[PDB]
């Protein structure tokens, strides 16, 4: 009878594999298996994550083929992947990320070997593209109902675990079903390779190609955007002619939610492209 | 709260018992079965579903259009269940008029008595002496004292009074219930070891009317169809012969159309003999006198003579009824009502 404060390490491998698996996350139930290595009690690291073929039955213990699982795991053992399985993941579209009776039964059956048995449910269907916040699930012991529910130390990270604060699922089904915190990790090779890879993904090939395109489109296409920009500017100035009357009458309180200032600041920012690219044309013409 | 105390303490095992029996798919009823694996089912939400049969329910226990429990996760049939109120409401087991009310028909009472009383008493005599016992008779025409011979046939069984079925209960809202009605009362007729079933008021289901043509043509398919039985009993009671479909389909299995209009002089004293167990009649009252002092006095009309005359005997505040005290009720209820009718 002892418990610690565990935290699931999530690298970009399992993340991107759950993003491609979320793209393949059809309404039909899907299956997946997580791998890794157990170094101590209160830490768990995932490295290898793959997908499983779909079945008409869906998420179930019968769909997990032991000769296929052990066959692929053996083919990972003959390669440079000497990691044992650490858990299984799946997708729950529509009805929420909670776990049904079948999922908790195959979780109870799959947790006999690994005491941790990390469970992750990805649901990118109804989640907006602004946040990719994912949560890992855990199974509590049925004999711990007499004593405290979760005797987990280091209660600081629970404030970060309070971000999924839906008022129906977390404490709507929190009995006999709790969760765990999630952190990330990134080395310098992922930082510089993925950082320079994304900057290059927003940059050009030689980085000098599409500059003169806009530098010379300022004279052909942007002129229409400058004339229309002046049409919006005058289209606001026609009301700014009426503003000094109200400002000359009341001077107390603000009733119009429009600021008429920051939009024109943005118009000036779009208009400064001519100034910033004029020096570019000066460099291209010079040398 | 005192009832909820012992059950509240008995609510602990309801959590460990909540995982089973949780399955409920709104009790969807099936329609037919093309093959044994796949069953076509239709839910009440007008959504037709198809699922395979589970291992907990035998295929021989499946009935056409049977409401059974079915899972909403595996979609399989976990456990069936036995379950209109008019069907069980129409059950009738009560003693009633005996044979003593024969309405003067000397030959007709034997034409129906040899088919209502004799075939049950002598099953081997009619199979060996012939090929099968007779089918039944057909009482129709003028109402008069109708339904008296029906109670006669009900009470004149030496074993147990049987069920009678009126026809005015099928013309109701939500048509289609008649099919399951006749199929489950004929199924119960198979359960009652070849019991006899009487069908009253065929005119209330015969003679748009296609929704009635379903129940009455299916009724013909269940009568001419010997699946429940083709030998027990056939008898219909109607006021008018304006039902041509049962009249043209009846020669297949129904037979022996007879009539029962009115009794004779020596019969009304026998309806008074069955009224000897009615409201207390003094020994001074002669049944032959009161019987002969009223012509055109069929068993129903003199049943109303004993009803209204019974009412005036109650209003008289007397210990016993005397003919001199209710004869005014007799000739008043037959003559004052015979004036306009």
């Amino acid at each position: 009878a002892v418990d610690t404060a565990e935290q699931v390490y999530i690298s970009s491998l399992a993340l991107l594999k759950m993003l491609k698996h979320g793209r393949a996350g059809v309404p039909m139930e899907v299956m997946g298996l997580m791998l890794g290595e157990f170094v101590d009690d209160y830490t768990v690291r995932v490295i290898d994550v793959f997908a499983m073929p779909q079945s008409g039955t869906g998420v179930s213990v019968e769909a997990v083929d032991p000769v296929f699982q052990a066959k692929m795991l053996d083919m990972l053992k003959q390669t440079g992947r000497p990691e044992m399985v650490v858990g299984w993941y799946h997708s729950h579209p529509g009805f929420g990320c909670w776990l049904s009776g079948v999922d908790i039964n195959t979780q109870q059956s799959f947790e006999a070997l690994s005491e941790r048995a990390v469970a992750v449910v990805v649901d990118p269907i109804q989640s907006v593209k602004g946040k990719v916040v994912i949560d890992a699930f855990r199974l509590i012991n049925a004999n711990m109902m007499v004593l405290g529910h979760e005797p987990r130390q280091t209660t600081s990270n629970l404030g970060h675990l309070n971000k999924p604060s839906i008022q129906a699922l977390i404490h709507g089904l929190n009995r006999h079903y709790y969760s765990i915190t999630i952190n990330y990790r990134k080395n310098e090779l992922e930082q510089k390779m993925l950082l320079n890879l994304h900057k290059k993904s927003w940059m050009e090939g030689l980085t000098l190609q599409d500059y003169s395109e806009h530098c010379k489109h300022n004279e052909s296409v942007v002129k229409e955007m400058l004339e229309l920009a002046k049409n919006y500017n005058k289209a606001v100035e026609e009301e700014d002619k009426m503003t000094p009357e109200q400002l000359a009458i009341k001077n107390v309180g603000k009733q119009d939610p429009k600021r008429h200032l920051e939009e024109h600041v943005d118009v000036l920012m779009t208009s400064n492209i001519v100034q910033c690219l004029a020096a570019m044309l000066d460099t291209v013409v010079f040398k | 709260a005192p009832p909820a105390l012992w059950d509240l303490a008995a609510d602990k095992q309801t959590l460990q018992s909540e995982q089973p029996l949780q399955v409920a798919r709104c009790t969807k009823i099936i329609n037919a079965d093309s093959e044994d694996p796949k069953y076509i089912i239709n839910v009440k939400q007008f959504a037709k579903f198809v699922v395979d049969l589970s291992d907990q329910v035998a295929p021989t226990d499946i009935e056409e259009g049977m409401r059974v429990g079915v899972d909403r996760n595996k979609y399989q049939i976990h456990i069936p269940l036995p379950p209109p109120t008019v069907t069980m409401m129409q059950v009738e087991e009560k003693p009633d008029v005996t044979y003593s009310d024969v309405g003067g028909c000397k030959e007709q009472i034997e034409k129906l008595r040899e088919v209502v009383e004799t075939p049950l008493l002598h099953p081997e005599r009619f199979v060996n002496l012939g090929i099968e016992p007779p089918k039944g008779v057909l009482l129709f025409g003028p109402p008069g004292t109708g339904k008296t011979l029906c109670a006669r046939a009900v009470a004149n069984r030496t074993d147990a009074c049987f069920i009678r079925v009126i026809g005015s209960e099928l013309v109701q809202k939500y048509v289609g219930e008649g099919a399951r009605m006749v199929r489950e009362l004929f199924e119960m007729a198979r359960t009652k070891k070849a019991c006899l079933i009487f069908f009253d008021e065929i005119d209330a289901i015969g003679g748009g009317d296609n929704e009635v043509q379903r129940t009455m043509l299916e009724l013909i398919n269940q009568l001419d169809g010997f699946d429940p039985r083709g030998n027990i009993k056939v008898l219909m009671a109607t006021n008018r012969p304006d039902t041509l479909d049962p009249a043209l389909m009846r020669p297949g299995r129904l037979d022996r159309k007879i009539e029962f209009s009115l009794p004779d002089l020596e019969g009304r004293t026998h309806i008074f003999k069955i009224h000897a167990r009615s409201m207390s009649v003094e020994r001074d009252i002669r049944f032959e006198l009161l019987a002969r002092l009223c012509p055109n006095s069929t068993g129903a009309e003199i049943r109303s003579v004993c009803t209204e005359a019974g009412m005036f005997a109650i209003r008289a505040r007397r210990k016993i009824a005397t003919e001199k005290d209710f004869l005014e009720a007799v000739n008043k209820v037959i003559k004052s009502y015979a004036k306009f009718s």
Binding site: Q126, G130, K131, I166, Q167 | -
Partner: protein, 198 residues
């Protein structure tokens, strides 16, 4: 962005309470396949939520937020309309028994709208017109009391139609019970109009 989780809440429903229960479990009439009885949130009291009113209810937590909703004619009329123009205060010291209303019977050629809106236009006060739907405008006349009210639409044996008409006769009788009953707001003066057997 903290509200973005309430955007992810898929919105919220519109609850309508029809009956309050004493067990702190108020049933709320909702959209069909609704009728979800539930206890309200702890920061909102139960007694304040009145039945037969619409409220704001969340779609998952089922918690309540708040409650939801002619020179001679002008010479003779100066004492009637031109008197309350300049001295609204004198209506408490003056004890000369100012009249409550005035009637003008005859062919309504000029004087029904141009006179009342012209002299009332000199009064610079609001002009409310009458134009069962005959009681809500009387409640509006109770709210905005200081004005010039004029009958224009009604000017056109006992029976049920004389009982329904007797509802408006009761409206003007209680106008004599309020006006002639007790003065509560200066400048209450009205003008009658009647041209027939009435």
């Amino acid at each position: 962005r903290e509200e973005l989780q309430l955007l992810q809440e898929q919105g919220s429903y519109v609850g309508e309470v029809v009956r309050a229960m004493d067990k702190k479990k108020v049933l709320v009439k909702v959209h069909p396949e609704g009728k979800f009885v539930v206890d309200v949130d702890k920061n909102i009291d139960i007694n304040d939520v009145t039945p037969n009113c619409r409220v704001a209810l969340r779609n998952d937590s089922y918690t309540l937020h708040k409650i939801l909703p002619l020179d001679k004619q002008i010479k003779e009329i100066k004492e009637v309309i031109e008197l309350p123009v300049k001295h609204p205060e004198l209506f408490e010291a003056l004890g000369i028994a100012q009249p409550k209303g005035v009637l003008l019977y005859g062919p309504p050629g000029t004087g029904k709208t141009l006179l009342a809106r012209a002299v009332a236009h000199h009064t610079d006060c609001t002009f409310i017109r009458v134009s069962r739907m005959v009681r809500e405008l009387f409640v509006m006349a109770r709210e905005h009391a200081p004005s010039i009210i004029f009958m224009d639409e009604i000017d056109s044996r006992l029976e049920g139609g004389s009982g329904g008409d007797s509802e408006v006769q009761r409206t003007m009788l209680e106008l004599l019970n309020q006006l002639d009953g007790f003065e509560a707001t200066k400048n209450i003066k009205v003008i009658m109009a009647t041209n027939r057997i009435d």
